[PDB]
């Protein structure tokens, strides 16, 4: 029987997902104009166009964040990775939700992620590249952050600050976690043998 642990203990899927999330985050930041367009250069990934920042500290921040996400994926401790767009008052305006499920057993009847990784992931990238045509216009001056929704059961005897790979993370507060009954915009869903992933956007109502 083929199991998730058979693919290098979850490291393959964690490495593929962090590669993907880096590119997807960059593209979100471009199309939503979180940063000036001049920092992004055109590249290819998954044989499709992508737009990637050349700003060193932005780049390193995104890599550092994903460095912390990688072990959480390897231990199967991630339900969602969310790119949260915050307005100038620091309130969430929009959320790009990457909903990730890694079952312990491979799904038999589903497409092979590893034989078809470019085509499968490209689909998500192409949707992001044109999403501005289905979303509302963000107010000026938005910023972003990244929320990781884990599988760990919460337990009220808990320290807000959690250090991962020497970077301090925090339990996310009401100011970010809460959107007032948002509108859900589906972008893309995939079910493959190893990985189920859904991308959708939450927009403030």
């Amino acid at each position: 029987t083929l199991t998730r642990q058979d693919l290098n203990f979850g490291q393959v899927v964690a490495d593929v997902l962090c590669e993907f999330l880096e590119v997807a985050v960059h593209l979100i930041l471009y199309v939503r104009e979180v940063y000036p367009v001049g920092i992004f250069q055109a590249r290819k990934k998954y044989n499709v166009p992508v737009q990637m920042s050349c700003h060193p500290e932005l780049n390193q921040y995104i890599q550092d964040t994903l460095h912390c996400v990688k072990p959480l994926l390897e231990k199967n401790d991630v339900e969602k990775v969310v790119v949260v767009i915050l307005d100038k008052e620091h309130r969430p305006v929009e959320k790009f939700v990457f909903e990730i499920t890694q079952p312990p057993l491979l799904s038999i009847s589903s497409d092979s992620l590893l034989s078809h990784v470019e085509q499968l992931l490209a689909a998500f990238i192409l949707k992001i590249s044109v999403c501005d045509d289905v979303l509302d216009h963000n107010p000026p001056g938005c910023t972003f952050t990244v929320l990781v929704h884990t599988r760990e059961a919460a337990t009220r005897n808990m320290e807000k600050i959690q250090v991962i790979k020497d970077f301090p993370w925090i339990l996310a507060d009401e100011q970010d976690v809460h959107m007032h009954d948002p509108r859900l915009i589906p972008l893309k869903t995939m079910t493959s043998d190893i990985l189920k992933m859904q991308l959708y956007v939450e927009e403030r109502a």
């Binding site: 979180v34 940063y35 000036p36 001049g38 920092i39 700003h55 500290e57 932005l58 921040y61 995104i62 964040t65 912390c68 339900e79 949260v84 001056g141 910023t143 972003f144 952050t145 990244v146 929320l147 990781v148 929704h149 884990t150 599988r151 760990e152 059961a153 919460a154 808990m158 600050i161 959690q162 970077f167 301090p168 993370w169 925090i170 339990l171 996310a172 970010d176 976690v177």
Partner: peptide, 25 residues
């Protein structure tokens, strides 16, 4: 039954920081 949701304590570089870098060349 709630799960732990976490975010970085530190912000990404601000838009203005990046604007200064770009304009500088």
């Amino acid at each position: 039954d709630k799960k732990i949701v976490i975010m970085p304590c530190k912000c990404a570089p601000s838009r203005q920081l990046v604007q200064v870098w770009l304009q500088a060349k």
